[PDB]
Design a binder for this molecule. Sequence first.
Ligand SMILES: N[C@H]1CC[C@@H](N2CCCCCN3/C(=N/S(=O)(=O)c4cnc(N[C@H]5CCNC5)c(c4)C2=O)Sc2c(Cl)ccc(O)c23)CC1
Ligand SMILES: Nc1nc2c(ncn2[C@@H]2O[C@H](COP(=O)(O)OP(=O)(O)NP(=O)(O)O)[C@@H](O)[C@H]2O)c(=O)[nH]1
Ligand SMILES: [Co+2]
Ligand SMILES: [Co+2]
Ligand SMILES: [Mg+2]
Length: 162
Amino acid sequence: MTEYKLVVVGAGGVGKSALTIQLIQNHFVDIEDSYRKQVVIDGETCLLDILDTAGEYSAMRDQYMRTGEGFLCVFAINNTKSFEDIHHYREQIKRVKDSEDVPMVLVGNKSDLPSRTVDTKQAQDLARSYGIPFIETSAKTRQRVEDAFYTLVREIRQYRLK
Ligand SMILES: N[C@H]1CC[C@@H](N2CCCCCN3/C(=N/S(=O)(=O)c4cnc(N[C@H]5CCNC5)c(c4)C2=O)Sc2c(Cl)ccc(O)c23)CC1
Ligand SMILES: Nc1nc2c(ncn2[C@@H]2O[C@H](COP(=O)(O)OP(=O)(O)NP(=O)(O)O)[C@@H](O)[C@H]2O)c(=O)[nH]1
Ligand SMILES: [Co+2]
Ligand SMILES: [Co+2]
Ligand SMILES: [Mg+2]
């Protein structure tokens, strides 16, 4: 059965654990580990192996970046530093993978909040510059959570045909 190693990265408190638990448990959470879930995407069954990371020992961070097949780069829409810090997570992943081309999806989490400091258009334009998809999600309401993870799997599949 095809297996995909997914990694959720981003600054402290953006919602990495809440997004992962929402995909696994369908529940909004009120320790960093890995989670497994068999899913069907586009008529193909696969096993998702998801690592929830911290906002860590450098050698371990490099290992998860080396092992990871696809990365969800998460920022929160009310946290400008978390959005600016996407540059750093992207740079670190591309450096470890020694590739300009790594399956990645930019995620703007907390879309339910009325305290938005990052415009959708700003994050859209950044994602276009990076050549990656951009999705806004709410781990609280489950809005677009499956879309974020399933879009990441589709990017990994498109990459594997290259
Ligand atoms: N279950 C205990 C012992 C393992 C701990 N752990 C995290 C789970 C490792 C899962 C195996 N794994 C990996 N193993 S690892 O590369 O040796 C590794 C990397 N980071 C780890 N922990 C860091 C991530 C969470 N914050 C510290 C652990 C193991 C690491 O030391 S990489 C990886 C990826 Cl990219 C996707 C899915 C994965 O399941 C995966 C969690 C607590
Ligand atoms: N309103 C709202 N709050 C959210 C959302 N996702 C996460 N939160 C809240 O944000 C806080 C941090 O969430 P958490 O999932 O721990 O984030 P994290 O990125 O995993 N934290 P860390 O890097 O420490 O591990 C919690 O209070 C959580 O309830 C969301 O979509 N909307
Ligand atoms: Co509960
Ligand atoms: Co830099
Ligand atoms: Mg967490």
